[model samples]
Target: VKNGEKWMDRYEIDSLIGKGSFGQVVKAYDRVEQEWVAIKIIKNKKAFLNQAQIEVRLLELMNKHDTEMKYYIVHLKRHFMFRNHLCLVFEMLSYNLYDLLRNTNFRGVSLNLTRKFAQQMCTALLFLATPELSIIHCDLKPENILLCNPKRSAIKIVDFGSSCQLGQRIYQYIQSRFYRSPEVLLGMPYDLAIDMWSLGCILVEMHTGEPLFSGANEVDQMNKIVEVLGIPPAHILDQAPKARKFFEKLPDGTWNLKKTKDYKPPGTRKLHNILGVETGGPGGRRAGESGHTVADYLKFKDLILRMLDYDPKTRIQPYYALQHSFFKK
Candidate 1:
């Protein structure tokens, strides 16, 4: 990987952006277009090659549907085979939401800033939910969402390597652990609703500067959720094939959480306490000091509760989420 080397006699490599299991991404200069771009160079292994193909297919499909580029999805400029490796070209974008959070020293951005992000994210999800392109991002954390500029709220979602069309989900252990949905954890069939759950978690972390459910593992993850949201409904648990791993059915027809030693009592970790809505702050800062009122936090909490509905069937959809009161004021 030499800097200043030309690829396909068009893109000049500037520097390596990052590396991953798929391969590496490089910052490049497109001489012909006189612009900068990020080029993802896929690994030259058979398995990686096949997976990259799927990413290309989905990216193209998304690009086609987002003809006007009004939606906040990252644009895949083009892709081609170079020296037996598939390379994808993407429009250059600034640092991701996680980087933005880090810049804030993890105290989190203001509610006003969080609202800007939430609106755009919901719009993106609405686009994905369209009938023509029922794509599932599968991954929707802060790291995957990139800002268009360091000084602005405008952003775009990137990284489709693990994404798939709805009903065509391929991976069971999909989604980063913190944002994984309950349905996926229960080993039940899932759909677009999983992404909604992730959004709920993401929005909370965005304003609070911490993962809402920072679980250690599958067992701990379920416990974390139970701590705040309480146990899954009896019917939902009854249908979950993996329920026994985290819960047990008692002879009295009640569900019991399997592991109890270190777990907080159900609903003890109240969302209000987590958000510091009533008490004014969770980490020594006053909510009013951040320009957020109790009413604002209440509305935000209500919207997140809907997004985090344990049953996917009842989870809030993007269209309705946009119309939520939190977005109104």
Candidate 2:
């Protein structure tokens, strides 16, 4: 409740860290361990109770394997019920990537810094996608990605309330709207690729100091994606009947799957502008003051394109993504 409040006779609440639909995360001090930690307290409601317990279960499963725990994933030390609220203890961290970006006045970080963060994210995601234990972090965005320390780029992926084990999804609607993949938005079944799409949106924002797709609503968000990447092929849309109203699917399957007459795509230039390097630009030469070369910039764009592929089957796998030349640059 208040600062200095002690819970379970061990953790003393120092301040509120974050608030979400189901609960609040509070900065707390562990009296026994003499260390700072975060305690996520679930709201006292039956519905929230189920969600909170599921999160705890997922986190435990994620940390069950020693291999995955070595990467940049938030570690859940333990959990206990305190005054009927399901409380989870986790290693405390500093500002999230969003806070770091805000501190820069959203002017964006250097390409090198962006690359470092992206690599860490990929490492974490790759671990989560391991075949024996596929954990789909349904919501992967800047806010949920935290810097272990403000002084370092090392990050941990947090917030598992929306997470699930691959095909064992508990909810249909997952992922933040901006980071939502085409499959999720169109009511098609999805998998780990959803997280990859979110990563692509995040890394672009890290470079541009703004969301790559800032759609106000689901429909608008879909529009933003289509405008940048062009419409999804008829075959992709044909798989999601719910999305038919958003685009006109031709009977013969050769017509343009344009956005309903209500909206017109702003064209591809908007995306190129956001990336600060065009598909066929002078590369870093256009931004002469920037240190990156044209080839370096193109490799970076190529990675983003691969990540944002409309077909989940063809999207860049997390491990292969790490091998891309963009990381070298």
Candidate 3:
């Protein structure tokens, strides 16, 4: 460890670009390549605490066979430990989808643009949801989706702290609520399909300018879900056997959860509103944007909803969603 200066030898830390639970993303220039790279240095203790190593290992495994969607993720460099951290290096994106959405909330995303972006996400999900190496992305949100460039976007699918590689042993509770599938709510077994459900929640937020299933508590949330999507059907609902006992009838009433197809929120925002119209913009002027419309895309809103379905099993497959009408370009 005496001559441990090799790691820091070539790069100059320009500034701290971003920060997260793993570590800080320092904007650095590679002296050898004369390029700018965001070095995501993580802490070992924290990484170990959050199972970051396992996520990294999974990424390595997933990347090996991911020919089509490999570009969706930022490459990981190394994980050397220091006194308190395990440093991880990642490709620095100009901005995250979270920042993009917040900035473009008023103008909204165009249907063509949304489809283009969603198609990519579908590709990543399809590849990641491979039956061969199933990985349930417990945390799938906008903050994790980064814009690779102005013309393109990439989803890192970062933060696997709550994930469990399928065929691997069961772990504790996984996934953030609101994004969690109904099976999870019923305390039933689920698989990678759950990730599709989470993606739906996030996409709704991006498209509608609000969370699809926004609720602070379980009861309130379920009410919101049933209000729009109806209740879980007995076929899927009763599969758990003890679901009735677990899911007591609420005074608010519930529907025999409709098929994912029939359940559409009445007041949800149209795709047009998303394209720099509804939300405000970054340049102090209303963010004006133009692109294709949902009518122009081959895919239907129903197609995307299928992925966002309340039932994990019924959620659309990534392979199938990727083949939809939107990503023709």
- Top-lDDT candidate index: 1
Give the TM-scores of the predictions, in the order they appear.
0.96, 0.92, 0.76
Candidate 3 lDDT at 45 equals: 69
| TM-score of predicted structure 2 | 0.92
Local error of candidate 2 at residue 166 (angstroms): 1.3
Each model's lDDT comes to: 0.87, 0.82, 0.61
lDDT tens digits by residue: candidate 3, 23-129? 56677766777777776666556545457677677767776774766666666654455556655656667776678778876344545455656777777787777
lDDT string for model 1 (183-248, tens) is 999998888999999999998898789899988898888899999999899999989989998999
lDDT of 2 by residue, 26-85 (tens): 999999999999988898899989987888887887777787534688889999887888
RMSD (CA, angstroms), candidate 3 = 6.4
Model 2 per-residue lDDT at 64: 70
With a 3 Å backbone cut-off (N, CA, C), the pairs that clash in candidate 1 are none
Best by TM-score: 1
Q: How high is the lDDT of residue 122 in model 3? A: 78
